[PDB]
Structure formats: C-alpha cells, structure tokens
Design a protein around this ligand. Structure first.
Ligand code: HEM
Ligand code: HEM
Ligand SMILES: Cc1cc(N)nc2cc(-c3ccc(CN)cc3)ccc12
Ligand SMILES: Cc1cc(N)nc2cc(-c3ccc(CN)cc3)ccc12
Ligand SMILES: C[C@H](O)[C@H](O)[C@H]1CNc2nc(N)[nH]c(=O)c2N1
Ligand SMILES: C[C@H](O)[C@H](O)[C@H]1CNc2nc(N)[nH]c(=O)c2N1
Ligand SMILES: [Zn+2]
Lengths: 409, 414
C-alpha cells in the first residue's frame, strides 16, 4: 500500500510507492523499532539475485524484455551454472555503483548520485596494484581542491578466503597514539588501527596529524604498507575569520573524505574493497571529528580562549564554542578553495533531492537519525521532514574489520 | 523475536540488554521491511470481550508491582473487575490503581526525556467532575499547585473515563497555557502562529481577543459530551518570564516573554483498557522547547532573523552560520531569564545526562526503557549531548499516553 510522508514546516505531502520494491530487512519489527541501532553466496541463491539486478538494469535503460535483456539473463545463468559466479558488464558495474549511492538511506549528499566517476579495478591481483589504483583515485578525486566524486572497485569476493580489503577505514586519516600517562596524541578514533600499522613495521612520526599509511590486502594475502605521496594529500589549516588566535590552535584537516571499509553489493556479488569519496559537510569535521569526547575534544580549549563561563552547563558554553569551530572549518575550506558544503545547504539539497526522487522514482529511502545534522537540527529543513527508511539493492553494507577475520600467513 | 536485545553507547562502549520489549503491546508502525520511526503519527469503545483481557493484564501488573501477585487480594480484585465488566461493560479503577497507572504512562512515554522524575508525580483524581465549571475549578487548582510560585511540581488531573464515546470529557486546548495567534488580512500573523486555529475557534465561541503578542488563551472545556464552555484562567495563576540576555542589553527590547508551566491537555491516558480523554499533565521546561522550537521555528515566532540583525552577523551566506550563532544566544537568554526569576527549568545538557542515568537504571532494574531517539535528542547541538551516541529501542508499553483527534473534528453540536 502507498505510504505518505509529510513535511510539517511546509505541509508538503509525498506518496511512497518505492518501498514496495524492497527486499532486504530494516532491523525493525511490528513491535520494536530499531531506527537508532547502527548495525541491526551459492549458485542457488545467486541467480535470482542476479536476475533481479539484470532486470532493473534493462528496465532503467528502457529495454525490458528486449532480446539483449533475454540473452544477458541466459548468459548469466549459464555462467553461474558453470563457474558458481558471474562477472558484471562494464555498464552494469557503473549502474550498480551509482545506485548503491542512490539507495544509501543515511547519505544526505545523494543529490549528486549520478555524477559518480567509477574506476574499474577488477583486474587487480596484488597490493602494489591496489596502491596504484588508489593513488590514481585520490589524485583524480582531489583535482586540486575542486573535488570530484569517485569509487574504485576491486575484484569481487570469491570463496571468502581471497578477499581484497582496504584495512584503513578511510584512505586518508590521522594517526592516534595512546600516551604513557593515559591521554591520546592525534586522533583517538584511530588508535587501534595506528597500533596495527606500527606492529606491521610503520615508523610513526608520533605527531598530532600524521597521515596513516595504506594497509592493503589483495587476494586474501597478508596486507602490505604503502605511503601515499604527500603531494597527493590535500590539507587545510583551520583558521577563524574573527578570532585571530584560532590558527594558534595548530589545527588542520584533510580535504578528501574517502570511506574504504564498506562492502558494495551488486546483483548478489560482493565487492569487499571499494573505496569511495565525495566532499565534506562541515559538521563531519567541525562537530564530530573535533568535538566528540571520544575524538579530538577541543571544545574546552576553544571556549577558554573565547573566555566563556565554563562552570555551569546552562551557560551553553559548549554550544557557543561548537558554532565557532564550525565557522572556522567552513571559512578555511572556502578560503583555500577546497570543496565543502555547510549543513544548511546540504540539507536543502536533500529536501530538493527527495522531491525529485518521489517524482521520478516513487520514493527515496532516508534515515532521519543520520540525515539530520549533529548540530542545529531543527533549524534545518530535514528535521521537520518525515522520512521512510527501507533497504534497496544495490547497496553499501558494513563488514567486519579484517584483523578480526584474517589468518596471517 | 528473541529474548534479549542489546543496545550500545558508541561514546562509552557501555552495552545494555533489554528484556522488557517482550511485554510490548501495540504496533509501532514499523515492519520487517520498513521503518517509520520519524513519522509523527504512524465511537470506538471497547467491548466486554476486548476489555476483559486488557484489565486483567493491568491488574496483574499492578499486583505484581506491590509484591502481592497471586494473593487473595489479587484474586478478589480480578473477580470484582470481571463481574463489573460483565454487568456494566466497564469498570472503575481503585485510587491506588489510578495513581499507579498514571505514573507508569509517564514512565512508559518513549518520547519523554524527563522520565527520571516519573515516580514523583502528584495525581489529582477528578472523576467526580460533572460540569465544565467543575473542570475549570480542578484545572485552576492544578495550575496553582504545579506552579508553586516558580518551584514547579509535576502533576496530572484525571477527569472521568470514556463511556459510550458520546459523553467524553475533553480539554479542547492543546496546552492549559498558550498564547493566541491571529491571522491578519495581509497574510501576516500576530502572536503564536501555532495556535491560530484554536484561537479562531475560541473567538467563534465568544472570546473577545486583546489581539496582542502574548494573550493567554481561555480554557475551552467539554464535560460529559456537552458543548464546550469558555473560562478565563485567573491572570495571577499564570507565571510568566520576560526573556532577557546576560550580555546583550538590547535583548529585552525584543519584548519577548514566555509562560513557566508546560501543561499538555489534548492527550489520552489509557489504563487497563480504560480511556481518559481529559488528563492534563504538566512538568517543567527544557530550555530548547521554548528557545529553539517556540521561538526559532519558521512557522513559530521566528525571531532568528531579528536577533541576527541586532548581533550584526553576516546574513547573506548560510555558511557564516549566523542562524546557528543566533540560536545559541536565544537559548542562553531563555535559560538565564528563567533561572534569574527562580522558575524551574533545565538545559538540554543536564536533561540528557539525567536521562542516560535514568535509562541505565531502568535497563538494570526493569529490564529496559522504551525511548524514541528522534524525539529524545534535542533540536540543537545533538552530538554534544550524551543521548546522540546512545542506541535505543522503541516500543509501546501500557499504561500509556496516546494521541487523539482534535475534538472539533468529531463533536456533535447540541
Ligand atoms: C558528494 C558529496 C557527499 C556528501 C556531502 C556526503 C555527505 C554525507 C554525510 C554527512 C554522511 C554522514 C557521515 C557521518 O556522519 O559519518 C554520509 C554518509 C554516507 N555516504 Fe555520503 N556524502 C557524499 C558523497 C557520497 C558518495 C560519493 C558515496 C558513495 C559512492 C556516499 C555514500 C555514503 C554512505 C554509504 C553513507 C553512510 C554509510 C552508513 O553508515 O550506512 N556518499 N554522507
Ligand atoms: C518533569 C519535567 C519534564 C520534562 C523536563 C520533560 C521533557 C520533555 C520534552 C523536552 C519533551 C519533548 C517535547 C517536544 O519536543 O515538544 C517531552 C515529551 C513528552 N512528555 Fe515529558 N517532560 C517532563 C514531564 C512530563 C510529565 C510529568 C509527563 C506525564 C505525566 C510527561 C509526558 C510526556 C509525553 C507523553 C511526551 C511526548 C508526547 C508525544 O508523544 O508527542 N512529561 N517531555
Ligand atoms: C562518501 C562520503 C562523503 C562524506 N562527506 N562523508 C562520508 C561519510 C561516511 C561515513 C563515515 C563514517 C561512518 C561511521 N563513523 C559512517 C559513514 C561515508 C562516506 C562519506
Ligand atoms: C509534560 C511535559 C513537560 C515538558 N517540559 N514538555 C512537554 C511537551 C509535550 C509535548 C509538546 C508538544 C508536542 C507536539 N508539538 C508533543 C508533546 C508534552 C508534555 C510535556
Ligand atoms: C519529522 C520529525 O519526525 C518531526 O519533526 C519531529 C522530529 N523530532 C522531534 N523531537 C522533539 N523532541 N520534538 C519534535 O517536535 C520533533 N519533531
Ligand atoms: C546511536 C546513534 O544511532 C548513533 O550515534 C548515530 C546517530 N546519528 C548519526 N548520524 C550521522 N550522520 N552520523 C553518525 O555517526 C550518527 N551516529
Ligand atoms: Zn523502525
């Protein structure tokens, strides 16, 4: 049955028919909602999954039931029969990748989904080759600050014993170190991965913003360390348009957000290595990266320099320091002409994007809990926007951290 | 379902195990293939057969709570209720049961961040009420008691339950205390835009509006299914706070003020299958309720722009975050004004911190705590409050507070 979503600010009402095409589960039941939970093949299973994907591909290019469509199905069935798997055509690969992004309920940036540069790395066989592909990705995506969305797709999972994995959670991240006393130098989110690198032979500068090495795993072998050429890593020193002391905090960040630990699923096939990149919404750095307790935690230091009253919470000193930090981040990127979007602008685009999708697609899966920005929620248009969440394929999925699964040789 | 459900806090890595969801009663609106957790809203009267098991379930729960489950008293109460349903098709709650039910409707309110206080709730029994004048009397006493000269005390007043659905008691007001909103011919709105509809209804019922920015609405009260009647709440019973700012001298020049007592009156209380259509209840405010939503919402007082102008922020780029900056100062002002005037209020950092402690305790001692993340997380600065990183489970336990249609949509005029 059709479902309605209402915007309470504008009273605009959209009708969802798209959810009727979903097949994967949300995590919820009729009795319990799990909307705030972060994480709620064989020949036999594979072909219908493949058949489904091939179907909507040919439906997308308006050639459903064509001879070419029929033949492709017959070709895929025979190939699963003989080899227990199948390979995607280049067109299918690109379509599948764009629609995995399109279907990403938690991404507020999806108005861009069809502008995605797809790099086909399924011929890769070694970690050295993975390194090369990734360098090319980073260079292309960065584009001297005029960032471009991209995804590099490495060979699909075979028997599960020969997975390609990027062990980094992002291509570019700063190191974190457990200090002797107990605190943390650098980025606390990355303390474990940093130690994994150090064990593998990485010589840490033990600085505050050390770019981590790539830890790359090809065909199920032991992962190998590589250093991204520094000239490929674009960074932005964070300063504030009024507070001239803000630069004295010695903060900077990287311009390219590039998530590398997720799994891309297309027509039953699993791509365990598929780093993808876009550009930042300011809050991702300014709110989460800098102000989470389990992160850089600079709220105190900034509020002190703003000489704010920090004894009582009701002075909202945390709230004030937060806005200023996020002003600094936006101002810094824009001044260095590195692509960035503020949460007001991003959330506006998303409402516009939703309207588009309801119009041409009959819906848009959207995770309110993740779509609403981590600051100033209700003065953004998405706060008052009702959303329906459901799981469409092709999709990006979570997967276990490889150091929990890998058997070292 | 399985017997155990785990939730994680991603900031502290604390994990909690929920068994209480097994007692869940109604549908959530979600299914296996769709989540509706951001949907605001995902005659009637129960029959003898429908009522029997619902009352039994509640009476069982009550006697379980006072450690007398299976006792002679438990069994006699069950038999008494059963016979009363059999021969009257309804039943009456004992005072103890009524008080227990009301407290637990609040305890079970998944959208409420303030539930650490749930056991401290003054329950006013108004089931002897027969007329709108009497409703007015009970409601005045509620306001005076709850307000306590600024030392607010949470309270609920419960009017007679529903019978045949044609004799409902209703408070037509959405809250006991709200400001009027007036639509102007030129398209603009004076006062509170959120209340324009109810204001017009009052004006049609006979109310003479002062037509100001902060006119307290009259009470519109329906007893026993009769046409509603208008009453003016004694002005001295309405505690208000002028909003000023601890640094900005000019903030007072905005002429803003708000009322101290948040008292919601359009919800339905459901206990053991009985339905109390008029059950006004009140607590004290979280600042953002007034400072973010009431003031800064576009379809509300919308002073963000004017505050920004007096702060001389660049308002041409959104990326200057002039809105964000203004919003903070506004909420600073609200909190400062209330505290200075010794009127009870809580900032979002305190409330969310208290709620986390509450939730943990509930998981520990009750086996869970239904919570709606979408409502629990505050409308500003979400990620720097401890609830943002806390996974939650939402499900519906009874007794409960429910939504119900606005009474003008269904009322048969005499
Ligand atoms: C082009 C600019 C983009 C912007 C501004 C943007 C913005 C965002 C933001 C703010 C989040 C929440 C991140 C967090 O809080 O951790 C997010 C999540 C996500 N994005 Fe986008 N994004 C962009 C491009 C992309 C691209 C190119 C892809 C894939 C091809 C993508 C796929 C995803 C996925 C899969 C998630 C959430 C993963 C999960 O937790 O399930 N995004 N995005
Ligand atoms: C004691 C101080 C209290 C505080 C600080 C508090 C705080 C809040 C807040 C901030 C909300 C969200 C409101 C909104 O965003 O519009 C809320 C909702 C709610 N509260 Fe509380 N509350 C308190 C007392 C109470 C009491 C005494 C009751 C009932 C006995 C109650 C029942 C509810 C219910 C049923 C909702 C959500 C209603 C819905 O589903 O829309 N609360 N509370
Ligand atoms: C492609 C892209 C762009 C962007 N601005 N942010 C992302 C953020 C994520 C992301 C990052 C981290 C997590 C879990 N901490 C969940 C999602 C993934 C991709 C992103
Ligand atoms: C008892 C109590 C205290 C408080 N501070 N806020 C409430 C807020 C509500 C509430 C207010 C508004 C809405 C829908 N706009 C839904 C629930 C209900 C009760 C409250
Ligand atoms: C669309 C969305 O569900 C709606 O605007 C909700 C979101 N969360 C909320 N949370 C609270 N506390 N109060 C609200 O009014 C809302 N509004
Ligand atoms: C518990 C909760 O689901 C978790 O902290 C989520 C909430 N919403 C989020 N939203 C975004 N965009 N990013 C996040 O990491 C989170 N964290
Ligand atoms: Zn759900």
């Amino acid at each position: 049955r059709f479902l309605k979503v209402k915007n309470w600010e504008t009273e605009v009402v959209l009708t969802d028919t798209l959810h009727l095409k979903s097949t994967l589960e949300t995590g919820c039941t009729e009795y319990i909602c799990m909307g705030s939970i972060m994480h709620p093949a064989t020949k036999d299973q594979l072909f219908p999954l493949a058949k489904e994907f091939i179907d909507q591909y040919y439906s997308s290019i308006k050639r459903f039931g064509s001879k070419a469509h029929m033949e492709r199905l017959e070709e895929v069935n025979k190939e699963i029969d003989t080899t227990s798997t199948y390979q995607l055509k280049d067109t299918e690969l690109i379509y599948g990748a764009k629609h995995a992004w399109r279907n990403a309920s938690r991404c507020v940036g999806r108005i861009q989904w069809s502008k995605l540069q797809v790099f086909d790395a399924r011929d890769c066989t070694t970690a050295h080759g993975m390194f090369n592909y990734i360098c090319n990705h980073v260079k292309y995506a960065t584009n001297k600050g005029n960032l471009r969305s991209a995804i590099t797709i490495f060979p699909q999972r075979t028997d599960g014993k020969h997975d390609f994995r990027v062990w980094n959670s992002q291509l570019i991240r700063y190191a974190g170190y457990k200090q002797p006393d107990g605190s943390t130098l650098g980025d606390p989110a990355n303390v474990q991965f940093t130690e994994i690198c150090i064990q593998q032979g990485w010589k840490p500068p033990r600085g505050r913003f050390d770019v981590l090495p790539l830890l790359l795993q090809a065909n199920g072998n032991d992962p190998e360390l590589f250093q991204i050429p520094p000239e490929l890593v674009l960074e932005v020193p964070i300063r504030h348009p009024k507070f001239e002391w803000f630069k004295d905090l010695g903060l900077k960040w990287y311009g390219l957000p590039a998530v590398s630990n997720m799994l891309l699923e297309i027509g039953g096939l699993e791509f365990s290595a598929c780093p993808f990149s876009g550009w930042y919404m300011g809050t991702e750095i300014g709110v989460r990266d800098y102000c989470d307790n389990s992160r850089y935690n600079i709220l105190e230091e900034v509020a002190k320099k703003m000489n704010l009253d920090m004894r009582k919470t009701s002075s909202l000193w945390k709230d004030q320091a937060l806005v200023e930090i996020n002003i600094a981040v936006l101002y810094s990127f824009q001044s260095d002409k590195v692509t960035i979007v503020d949460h007001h602008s991003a959330t506006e685009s998303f409402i516009k994007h939703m309207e588009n999708e309801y119009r041409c697609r009959g819906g848009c899966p959207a995770d309110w809990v993740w779509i609403v920005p981590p600051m100033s929620g209700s003065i953004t248009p998405v706060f008052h926007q009702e959303m329906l969440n459901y799981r469409l394929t092709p999709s990006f999925e979570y997967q276990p951290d490889p150091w929990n699964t890998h058997v070292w040789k």
